[PDB]
Amino acid sequence: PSQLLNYIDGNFVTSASSFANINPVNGKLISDVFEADAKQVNEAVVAAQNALKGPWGKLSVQDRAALIHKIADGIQARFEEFVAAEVADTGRPVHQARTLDIPRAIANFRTFADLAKTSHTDLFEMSTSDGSGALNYTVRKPLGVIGVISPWDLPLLLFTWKVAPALACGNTVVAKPSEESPSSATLLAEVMHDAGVPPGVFNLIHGFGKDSAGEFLTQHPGISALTFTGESKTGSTIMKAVADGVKEVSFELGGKNAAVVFADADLDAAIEGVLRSSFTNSGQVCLCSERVYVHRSIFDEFVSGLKVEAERLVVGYPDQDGVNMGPLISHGHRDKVLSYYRLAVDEGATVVTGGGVPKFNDERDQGAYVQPTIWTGLSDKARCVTEEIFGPVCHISPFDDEDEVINRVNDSNYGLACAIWTTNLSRAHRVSRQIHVGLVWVNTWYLRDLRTPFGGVKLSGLGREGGRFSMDFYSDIANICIKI
Amino acid sequence: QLLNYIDGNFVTSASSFANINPVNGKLISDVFEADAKQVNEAVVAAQNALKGPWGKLSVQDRAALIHKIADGIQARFEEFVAAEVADTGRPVHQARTLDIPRAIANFRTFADLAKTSHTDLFEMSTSDGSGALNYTVRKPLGVIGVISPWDLPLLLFTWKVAPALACGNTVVAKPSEESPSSATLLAEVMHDAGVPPGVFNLIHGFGKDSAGEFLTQHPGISALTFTGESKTGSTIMKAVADGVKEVSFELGGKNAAVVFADADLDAAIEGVLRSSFTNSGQVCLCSERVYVHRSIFDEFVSGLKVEAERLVVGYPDQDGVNMGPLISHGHRDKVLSYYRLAVDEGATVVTGGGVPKFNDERDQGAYVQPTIWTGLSDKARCVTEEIFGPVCHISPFDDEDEVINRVNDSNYGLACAIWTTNLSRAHRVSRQIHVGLVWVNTWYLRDLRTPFGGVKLSGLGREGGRFSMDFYSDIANICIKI
Amino acid sequence: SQLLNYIDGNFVTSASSFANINPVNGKLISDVFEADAKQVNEAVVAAQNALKGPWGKLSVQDRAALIHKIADGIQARFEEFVAAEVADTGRPVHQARTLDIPRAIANFRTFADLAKTSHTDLFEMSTSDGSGALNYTVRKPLGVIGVISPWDLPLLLFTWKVAPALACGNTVVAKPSEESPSSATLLAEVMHDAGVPPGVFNLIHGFGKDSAGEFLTQHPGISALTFTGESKTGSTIMKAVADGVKEVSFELGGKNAAVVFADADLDAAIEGVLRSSFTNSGQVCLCSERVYVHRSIFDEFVSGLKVEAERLVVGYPDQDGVNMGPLISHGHRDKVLSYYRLAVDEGATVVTGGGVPKFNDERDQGAYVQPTIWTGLSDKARCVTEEIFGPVCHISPFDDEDEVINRVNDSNYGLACAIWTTNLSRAHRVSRQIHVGLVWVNTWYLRDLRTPFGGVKLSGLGREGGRFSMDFYSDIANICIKI
Amino acid sequence: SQLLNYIDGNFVTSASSFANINPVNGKLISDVFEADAKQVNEAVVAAQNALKGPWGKLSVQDRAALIHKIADGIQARFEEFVAAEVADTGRPVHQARTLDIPRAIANFRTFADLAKTSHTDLFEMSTSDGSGALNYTVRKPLGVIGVISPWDLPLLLFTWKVAPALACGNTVVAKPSEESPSSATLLAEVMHDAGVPPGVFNLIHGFGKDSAGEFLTQHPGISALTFTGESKTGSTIMKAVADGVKEVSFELGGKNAAVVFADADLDAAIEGVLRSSFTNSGQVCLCSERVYVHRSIFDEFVSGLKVEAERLVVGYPDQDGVNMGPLISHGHRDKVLSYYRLAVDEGATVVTGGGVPKFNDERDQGAYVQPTIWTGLSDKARCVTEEIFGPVCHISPFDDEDEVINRVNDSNYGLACAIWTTNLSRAHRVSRQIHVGLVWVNTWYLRDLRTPFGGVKLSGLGREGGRFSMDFYSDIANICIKI
Ligand SMILES: NC(=O)c1ccc[n+]([C@@H]2O[C@H](COP(=O)([O-])OP(=O)(O)OC[C@H]3O[C@@H](n4cnc5c(N)ncnc54)[C@H](O)[C@@H]3O)[C@@H](O)[C@H]2O)c1
Ligand SMILES: NC(=O)c1ccc[n+]([C@@H]2O[C@H](COP(=O)([O-])OP(=O)(O)OC[C@H]3O[C@@H](n4cnc5c(N)ncnc54)[C@H](O)[C@@H]3O)[C@@H](O)[C@H]2O)c1
Ligand code: NA
Ligand code: NA
Ligand code: NA
Ligand code: NA
Numbered sequence A: 001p002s003q004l005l006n007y008i009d010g011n012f013v014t015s016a017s018s019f020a021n022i023n024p025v026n027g028k029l030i031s032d033v034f035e036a037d038a039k040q041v042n043e044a045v046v047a048a049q050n051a052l053k054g055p056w057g058k059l060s061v062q063d064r065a066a067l068i069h070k071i072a073d074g075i076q077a078r079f080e081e082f083v084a085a086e087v088a089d090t091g092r093p094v095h096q097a098r099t100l101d102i103p104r105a106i107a108n109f110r111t112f113a114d115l116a117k118t119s120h121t122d123l124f125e126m127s128t129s130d131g132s133g134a135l136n137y138t139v140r141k142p143l144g145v146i147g148v149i150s151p152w153d154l155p156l157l158l159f160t161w162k163v164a165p166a167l168a169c170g171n172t173v174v175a176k177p178s179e180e181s182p183s184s185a186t187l188l189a190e191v192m193h194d195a196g197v198p199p200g201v202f203n204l205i206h207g208f209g210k211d212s213a214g215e216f217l218t219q220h221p222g223i224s225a226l227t228f229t230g231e232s233k234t235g236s237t238i239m240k241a242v243a244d245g246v247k248e249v250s251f252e253l254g255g256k257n258a259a260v261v262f263a264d265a266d267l268d269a270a271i272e273g274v275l276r277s278s279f280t281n282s283g284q285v286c287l288c289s290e291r292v293y294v295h296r297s298i299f300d301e302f303v304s305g306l307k308v309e310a311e312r313l314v315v316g317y318p319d320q321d322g323v324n325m326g327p328l329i330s331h332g333h334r335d336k337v338l339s340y341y342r343l344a345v346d347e348g349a350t351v352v353t354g355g356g357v358p359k360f361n362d363e364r365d366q367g368a369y370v371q372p373t374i375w376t377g378l379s380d381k382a383r384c385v386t387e388e389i390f391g392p393v394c395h396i397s398p399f400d401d402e403d404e405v406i407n408r409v410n411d412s413n414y415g416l417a418c419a420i421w422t423t424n425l426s427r428a429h430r431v432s433r434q435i436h437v438g439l440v441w442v443n444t445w446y447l448r449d450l451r452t453p454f455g456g457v458k459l460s461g462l463g464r465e466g467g468r469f470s471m472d473f474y475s476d477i478a479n480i481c482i483k484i
Numbered sequence B: 001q002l003l004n005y006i007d008g009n010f011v012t013s014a015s016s017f018a019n020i021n022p023v024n025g026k027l028i029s030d031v032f033e034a035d036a037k038q039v040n041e042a043v044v045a046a047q048n049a050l051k052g053p054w055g056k057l058s059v060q061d062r063a064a065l066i067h068k069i070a071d072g073i074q075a076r077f078e079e080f081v082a083a084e085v086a087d088t089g090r091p092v093h094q095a096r097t098l099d100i101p102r103a104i105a106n107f108r109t110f111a112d113l114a115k116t117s118h119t120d121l122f123e124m125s126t127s128d129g130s131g132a133l134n135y136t137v138r139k140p141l142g143v144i145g146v147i148s149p150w151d152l153p154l155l156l157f158t159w160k161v162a163p164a165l166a167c168g169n170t171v172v173a174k175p176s177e178e179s180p181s182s183a184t185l186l187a188e189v190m191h192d193a194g195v196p197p198g199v200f201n202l203i204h205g206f207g208k209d210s211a212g213e214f215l216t217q218h219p220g221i222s223a224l225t226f227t228g229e230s231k232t233g234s235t236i237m238k239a240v241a242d243g244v245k246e247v248s249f250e251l252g253g254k255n256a257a258v259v260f261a262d263a264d265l266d267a268a269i270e271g272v273l274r275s276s277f278t279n280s281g282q283v284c285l286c287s288e289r290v291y292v293h294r295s296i297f298d299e300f301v302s303g304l305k306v307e308a309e310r311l312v313v314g315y316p317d318q319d320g321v322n323m324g325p326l327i328s329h330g331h332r333d334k335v336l337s338y339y340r341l342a343v344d345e346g347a348t349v350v351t352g353g354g355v356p357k358f359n360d361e362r363d364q365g366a367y368v369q370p371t372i373w374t375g376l377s378d379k380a381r382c383v384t385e386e387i388f389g390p391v392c393h394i395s396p397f398d399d400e401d402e403v404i405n406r407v408n409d410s411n412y413g414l415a416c417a418i419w420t421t422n423l424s425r426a427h428r429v430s431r432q433i434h435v436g437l438v439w440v441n442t443w444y445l446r447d448l449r450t451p452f453g454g455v456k457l458s459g460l461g462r463e464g465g466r467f468s469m470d471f472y473s474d475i476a477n478i479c480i481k482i
Numbered sequence C, D: 001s002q003l004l005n006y007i008d009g010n011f012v013t014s015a016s017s018f019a020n021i022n023p024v025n026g027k028l029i030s031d032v033f034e035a036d037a038k039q040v041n042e043a044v045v046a047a048q049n050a051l052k053g054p055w056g057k058l059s060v061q062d063r064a065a066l067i068h069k070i071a072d073g074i075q076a077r078f079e080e081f082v083a084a085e086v087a088d089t090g091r092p093v094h095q096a097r098t099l100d101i102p103r104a105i106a107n108f109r110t111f112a113d114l115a116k117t118s119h120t121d122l123f124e125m126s127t128s129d130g131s132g133a134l135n136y137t138v139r140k141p142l143g144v145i146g147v148i149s150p151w152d153l154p155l156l157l158f159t160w161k162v163a164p165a166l167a168c169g170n171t172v173v174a175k176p177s178e179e180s181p182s183s184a185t186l187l188a189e190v191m192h193d194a195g196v197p198p199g200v201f202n203l204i205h206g207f208g209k210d211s212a213g214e215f216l217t218q219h220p221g222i223s224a225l226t227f228t229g230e231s232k233t234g235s236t237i238m239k240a241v242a243d244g245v246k247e248v249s250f251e252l253g254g255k256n257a258a259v260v261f262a263d264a265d266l267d268a269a270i271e272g273v274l275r276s277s278f279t280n281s282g283q284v285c286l287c288s289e290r291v292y293v294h295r296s297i298f299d300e301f302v303s304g305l306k307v308e309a310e311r312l313v314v315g316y317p318d319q320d321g322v323n324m325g326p327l328i329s330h331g332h333r334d335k336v337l338s339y340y341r342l343a344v345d346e347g348a349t350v351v352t353g354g355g356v357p358k359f360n361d362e363r364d365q366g367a368y369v370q371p372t373i374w375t376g377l378s379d380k381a382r383c384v385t386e387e388i389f390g391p392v393c394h395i396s397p398f399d400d401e402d403e404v405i406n407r408v409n410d411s412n413y414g415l416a417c418a419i420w421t422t423n424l425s426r427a428h429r430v431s432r433q434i435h436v437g438l439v440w441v442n443t444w445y446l447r448d449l450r451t452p453f454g455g456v457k458l459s460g461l462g463r464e465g466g467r468f469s470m471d472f473y474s475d476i477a478n479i480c481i482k483i
Helices: A038-051 A061-077 A079-090 A094-118 A155-168 A183-195 A213-219 A232-245 A267-283 A296-312 A331-346 A402-410 A425-432 A467-473 B036-049 B059-075 B077-088 B092-116 B153-166 B181-192 B211-217 B230-243 B265-281 B294-310 B329-344 B400-408 B423-430 B465-471 C037-050 C060-076 C078-089 C093-117 C154-167 C182-194 C212-218 C231-240 C266-282 C295-310 C330-345 C401-409 C424-431 C466-472 D037-050 D060-075 D078-089 D093-117 D154-167 D182-193 D212-218 D231-240 D266-282 D295-310 D330-345 D401-409 D424-431 D466-472
Strands: A002-004 A006-008 A011-013 A017-022 A029-035 A121-126 A134-142 A145-149 A172-176 A202-204 A225-229 A248-252 A257-261 A289-295 A350-353 A373-376 A393-399 A417-421 A439-442 A475-483 B004-006 B009-011 B015-020 B027-033 B119-124 B132-140 B143-147 B170-174 B200-202 B223-227 B246-250 B255-259 B287-293 B348-351 B371-374 B391-397 B415-419 B437-440 B473-481 C005-007 C010-012 C016-021 C028-034 C120-125 C133-141 C144-148 C171-175 C201-203 C224-228 C247-251 C256-260 C288-294 C349-352 C372-375 C392-398 C416-420 C438-441 C474-482 D005-007 D010-012 D016-021 D028-034 D120-125 D133-141 D144-148 D171-175 D201-203 D224-228 D247-251 D256-260 D288-294 D349-352 D372-375 D392-398 D416-420 D438-441 D474-482
Touching: A002 A017, A002 A183, A006 A038, A006 A183, A038 A145, A038 A172, A038 A202, A038 A213, A061 A079, A061 A094, A061 A155, A061 A183, A079 A094, A079 A155, A079 A183, A094 A155, A094 A467, A094 D093, A121 C133, A134 C120, A134 C133, A145 A155, A145 A213, A155 A172, A155 A183, A155 A225, A155 A467, A172 A213, A183 A202, A213 A232, A225 A232, A232 A248, A232 B230, A257 A267, A257 A402, A267 A289, A267 A296, A267 A393, A267 A417, A289 A296, A289 A402, A296 A350, A296 A373, A296 A393, A331 A393, A393 A402, A402 A425, A417 A425, A425 A439, A425 B473, A425 C424, A467 A475, A475 B423, A475 D424, B004 B036, B004 B181, B036 B143, B036 B170, B036 B200, B036 B211, B059 B077, B059 B092, B059 B153, B059 B181, B077 B092, B077 B153, B077 B181, B092 B153, B092 B465, B092 C093, B119 D133, B132 D120, B132 D133, B143 B153, B143 B211, B153 B170, B153 B181, B153 B223, B153 B465, B170 B211, B181 B200, B211 B230, B223 B230, B230 B246, B255 B265, B255 B400, B265 B287, B265 B294, B265 B391, B265 B415, B287 B294, B287 B400, B294 B348, B294 B371, B294 B391, B329 B391, B391 B400, B400 B423, B415 B423, B423 B437, B423 D424, B465 B473, C005 C037, C005 C182, C037 C144, C037 C171, C037 C201, C037 C212, C060 C078, C060 C093, C060 C154, C060 C182, C078 C093, C078 C154, C078 C182, C093 C154, C093 C466, C144 C154, C144 C212, C154 C171, C154 C182, C154 C224, C154 C466, C171 C212, C182 C201, C212 C231, C224 C231, C231 C247, C231 D231, C256 C266, C256 C401, C266 C288, C266 C295, C266 C392, C266 C416, C288 C295, C288 C401, C295 C349, C295 C372, C295 C392, C330 C392, C392 C401, C401 C424, C416 C424, C424 C438, C424 D474, C466 C474, C474 D424, D005 D037, D005 D182, D037 D144, D037 D171, D037 D201, D037 D212, D060 D078, D060 D093, D060 D154, D060 D182, D078 D093, D078 D154, D078 D182, D093 D154, D093 D466, D144 D154, D144 D212, D154 D171, D154 D182, D154 D224, D154 D466, D171 D212, D182 D201, D212 D231, D224 D231, D231 D247, D256 D266, D256 D401, D266 D288, D266 D295, D266 D392, D266 D416, D288 D295, D288 D401, D295 D349, D295 D372, D295 D392, D330 D392, D392 D401, D401 D424, D416 D424, D424 D438, D466 D474
Parallel strands: A002 A029, A145 A172, A145 A225, A172 A202, A225 A248, A257 A289, A257 A417, A289 A393, A373 A393, A417 A439, A439 B473, A475 B437, B143 B170, B143 B223, B170 B200, B223 B246, B255 B287, B255 B415, B287 B391, B371 B391, B415 B437, C144 C171, C144 C224, C171 C201, C224 C247, C256 C288, C256 C416, C288 C392, C372 C392, C416 C438, C438 D474, C474 D438, D144 D171, D144 D224, D171 D201, D224 D247, D256 D288, D256 D416, D288 D392, D372 D392, D416 D438
Antiparallel strands: A006 A011, A006 A202, A017 A029, A121 A134, A121 C120, A134 A475, A350 A373, B004 B009, B004 B200, B015 B027, B119 B132, B119 D120, B132 B473, B348 B371, C005 C010, C005 C201, C016 C028, C120 C133, C133 C474, C349 C372, D005 D010, D005 D201, D016 D028, D120 D133, D133 D474, D349 D372
């Protein structure tokens, strides 16, 4: 049907082999995607290094920012095409693509263009023995060639989350989107081309990880940095792969995030919030809550309430009326999720709702759907309470005491996000600062200010991105000291 | 004898190893090597200390306690001088003016930064019209693993330790096997200042199959900050990858100095002498490559030769001394093998090129002579590989763009010194040098607030000023929906 | 027994003297030499000259080191400063030991630290010729700072201005309140003993109009006038420096509210408002003289506050369990009593106090009044709108959140506000809507010295504290290099 | 042609009208309605009210998008705006196309972007009970900003104040110079067409004393007065707002120096000084009217400048290769020629110019003068010390670096300075010692809108640009939460 090409040194190019892009709604072939080989990857990196010496490297910060705004304009002008591309690849509801995914990708470019325009560096004066003094000033320069490897849960959002600041800081890019979701990135390349981004500045390579484009990219000595969002295990692998070149790295990895509902929470608001934090994108967001802790005094009522709301969720077509949830990304991912559904029963869970796959009795039965699922009854040590499942599921457990629940939230090798529900002023601030995660929300979930630092602790990440943190990571910070 | 310091106690080990004075090859002390069991004990005690009295100090009180650590060092100044000198053979004057005062400055400066540092507040609108607040907070990262080298032992040791403690972390610190004494005195100051048990832990030993490796492998740490060789950095980066530990690396360099035709020539010769031979060339920041404009080349080399030959090589306390020995015999071996390699590569030996004769104990030491080469290609191994001795190669250049390209044609990128009196040239050329630090008309001048680090193989991340306050802290974002 | 000026490194007397009077008993405690215009000029000129001297040559590190020595010198004479503050003001010894003196010391240490750690900015830009340019900023001393301070927190407010002034490398001509000259004089001594170069810090005594205060504000030799005191005086001063376009920084009056919502920790709010209304006998610019309490807890709040207010021990600064000393002066008490009288005329119910206590001893010769609580006045009453500056508050009920926000903001002042509530959204939602420089939630007068401090409307001009002081007390210059 | 006030979303006329006069030929350009006190009041009330309308409800993001639309509206009418600026002032068309109009558009865009990216501060602190506290700051609109602007760079300086005011969520009552009312009026059209809510931006026309300008500064309804103009006028406005303790920001006069050191690129310095003395016919606050040149190159410098100055084309704004239009007005020319005579009387050597060109056409009815260069005056001459605001410079030799620094600083003004040297150390060492707000090395009037801008001494009060504007045009509030 469609073909998704690579984009290398200003041209769309095919490849020797291609792989299948499968619509998870109905199991059908969407497109063939040409897999970049090591030769093509090297050509992309070499093109990126050279482009640093071309027109791009000569642009003022203002001209660079203006061009980046043009990239955003071009996405905006093809908004519905990008919507259709994200949807076809992932089965996400159209409304979500229209309200979250595509706007945020546009916003990624604008915000970092803006940050680039307004950012400055530092001036330090000092005295010296000869009483004449000295000046130290800092400058931001492009780091060089940035390798980008991105996942399939929020394909264009996370892809642009990395590409936007990379370009805003004057770097050049070689980027490999998830093999599960390569469409919107390919459209982005067309927008880059049409906007007049110079050849070699942005390069798109398609492929898998190991023994494919992903691995070839991480191993190339020509990149200056590798920014990556994905599985924790994959982060470790990549970190080993770039260690010999001491490449700069930035990792946003797994999580087993908790939501906590205190007895003084607005209960209806918390039920709705947790529904959202557990089942958005069918539980396929790094930020989703797979552990929920609810005060003993409201536990039964919270659980009954969430069950009803979960069962009201419409699981169906992306453009179906009132749809809330699409399928999982792939049959392969469904197999992982269902084996955890199985594991939970074996570990002693009560299945409050879901626990299987919906039966549609139409073509969607050939897709990769599962049911939104709630468990109770597992110990804090259960595998299903400790390992990231990355599906539409949450286990819910009671607690009695604030310090107790804080300790249970923190008792994890992960540390990405946490959502806390309480109407109490002191409790909100006191509790939040004690959660060992990069991001806490109070009385909401996944509310984003793009200027904030974003990242995780422990196995969930290395480094911070967002705002000035991206401006620092994607730049060479250099100190120049002048003796006066 | 030098003991480990673990959970408030000085403890011995099943193995000890020799601390050899490099001036005369004499034994200074036996050093107990921490085994894996003891490294685990240091790490567990570090973790627990976070939950004790240390973790409950206000920022102001923490900073006060840190200023007390600095006072402790100052009150035992000469004792610290003596330890640094003994281990390494550095000139007494260098220790008194550079090494020890900087260590004190390290603690004081980061104490001050901690007291005055703040974070950010972001306001935003939301659909419902009520809005939201996002604010950031800096928390202790947790347990910081510190592994440090021998060139500037106390300075570099405390360059990591001070911000780590100022940010409320606890520390397991492993100083170089070549220079364990001043770090052991520090553990004494820490103890006498009433730093809670477990907050600062000193473990002695080597790298592979030793305390260093054991530290980097321990899942209980939250970060590893390292200063040493590039290949060691790569190794440690691999070691901590499975736990995805935060890392900060300051690694090797092959730094260049550049003398433009319009430089103040006498100041340039003096500056490059300092940048080449300070601490006997054993500083990561030393210039081992020098580029001089063709029109002043011969005059420069002659002038440098003379100055280089007036340098006094001898006892650390021998009045007028300029250079002590290299850190060790093993290290002199490496340096001498490079001395041979330069000749085999076709170098003219303008001066030095071997080892001085003393006819006393110093011949049992590990001395070499300050050495200057000319006549090698940019691709010669002695021009590209870090020697870490008191040596430089000098090469003529003709064009500005030429010398910039030649400076950057390196797998390293730590620092560069440039000499010129021209305003435009100074700033135009500076911004093009692909390194972490550029000095103009000076060398190794340091403001502790500035970002410090290297690019390419010379490092990962930046430390100093807010970059240390950021690295040694968890930055967390809290979002309140209103 | 004699308080001298400190000019160009010398303690000097003056032509005229005035009486420093203990408000506990009305007894003369010292004679204070009033600086005339000639001595004021001499002080400014000496401060100008010191800029060109060793002080101008100090590195920021060295300067900060010396400022810490000043702090050390206050610490070493801690109890004498306490005695000095107490003697002049009648404030409880406990307050002087825990609030007044330690904050003066912290003032010097904090701004020395800020000076040591502050840096400025680098901006890169592109140029037509493609070579680019660099813009960088530096902080330089502004010059000579004229400091004028009030009597409510004498040493705290005096050092609140002098510390950053000196931290930024300025020289200083400072004029403390006629009512409280003692601690400033001891501070001169500490400067002297610390070896602060002559002319760097100059202390002139006197009054305002037609005296040392007036003369300083009109001297063309100063680069800036920072002032804390009455709003009308701020206006006067602003006109006086106009011809010179001097930099100005004003912290002026207020009529601050406290608001207690139905979901507040009622016991904590009662204690809180008690502190906010009667601390330093209600003689702090930040004090709450208007209080709004939700209808559902009004009666219970007023009853609880009455009991606590009546438990307050009014007496000698070193009297065991003392909570309140006297007002600053007999003249100040006469104003406060004229307001007590006015409240009654305006129809107030006097919940407690409303007059002066009878001690039957020397205190009856001093300047005491009772802690006083009113109810029953409308928002337009003069006792509800004009700053009294005594140990008093009016309490009014309210019903709605938007209502009480409007009544708080319906004022020509806008210094500070305290809000009591346990609700998270309300705390943040209400706080941001109060038109003042400083809001506290579930506390009062908690100070982080890094934060901007100041008022809006008639309560001020500019901000001080942290980065704001480093900016105000500095010349910020941009240097632009074409490459 | 006719220029109306813009109030509460409506263009309105007035009882009084005055003439807009083309300085090129003395012809009438338009009539301008002078707003009276009633209308100024109407503007301020409208502005106050608009704070409570739709404007006050916009998110920072949406407010910023609107401001970008304002900039779009000026871009869409670019040439009309060029025509207006040129007509009012006689400035070269080229300068209006490359400096004046583009900077106005950039002003709005830059502050819109600053608003979008700016954040405030979070301070944590410990407390006695061990639970801690949070201090956070927020930026809120200050309120109604009164803006009063001069005629040297009409739209640039007008929008330099209007853009940050609107970006910080304030509402505006703005009074452009009587000499240059056109572009501001066209700006009102752009705002209207972009759908800026009524009352958010108000335009009042008139003069100073007994007119719109004075009335604006006296109105108790404004929250701040930002002003650019003569030093004396700044002093007057500062007195006028003092009773309200209104926030103030002043960018005032200057008598700026250029310094040419012996190691300067001589040709570049000659060209640079020519630009800095004669651009906009010397009618820019940033122009150099004093020039110091090292003795060794003095004669060579003066000769070169004389020749370059005599090659300058003085004529029509669109004339081929024109360098200078006329002065703003015959009245201003009268003042300038008065200074031309005075210099002769003070004993100056007129190196070039010193009179008015003879055109033999309609330009003879205009307000032209010749670019003029003087030598031989002492540092104390009136012509070397008072701001002339015409196309003129005096040149004097110096021998020593410390000497010339002292001579540059020996002034009651302190706006800007341009320095010419090829030496690295000297550029940085000398620049930091010059007591002005802005120094340029090897260039002049190079602007980065993020930098602090302002002057010292009589040249101003406070800073604007970048974070400094974000601070001046906002209420900075501190909110302290006890946890
Ligand atoms: N970039 C900088 O700022 C900086 C500063 C000083 C020194 N250096 C570099 O340090 C080097 C010289 O010092 P060095 O010889 O001690 O370097 P090194 O790598 O051999 O040793 C450094 C430290 O790491 C430890 N170590 C060695 N192997 C280890 C391992 N496998 N696991 C854990 N720890 C291990 C050592 O015991 C020692 O404490 C030079 O390359 C020099 O450039 C760099
Ligand atoms: N906003 C704040 O932070 C703050 C802090 C403390 C006090 N205050 C205010 O201070 C007032 C009480 O103190 P006060 O009675 O001493 O006020 P005041 O303004 O009458 O006197 C203050 C100082 O200014 C001097 N002074 C008086 N007239 C002067 C003049 N014409 N020119 C120059 N100096 C003059 C006085 O001698 C004294 O030193 C209260 O209104 C209180 O709110 C405000
Ligand atoms: Na797919
Ligand atoms: Na040794
Ligand atoms: Na008194
Ligand atoms: Na006109």
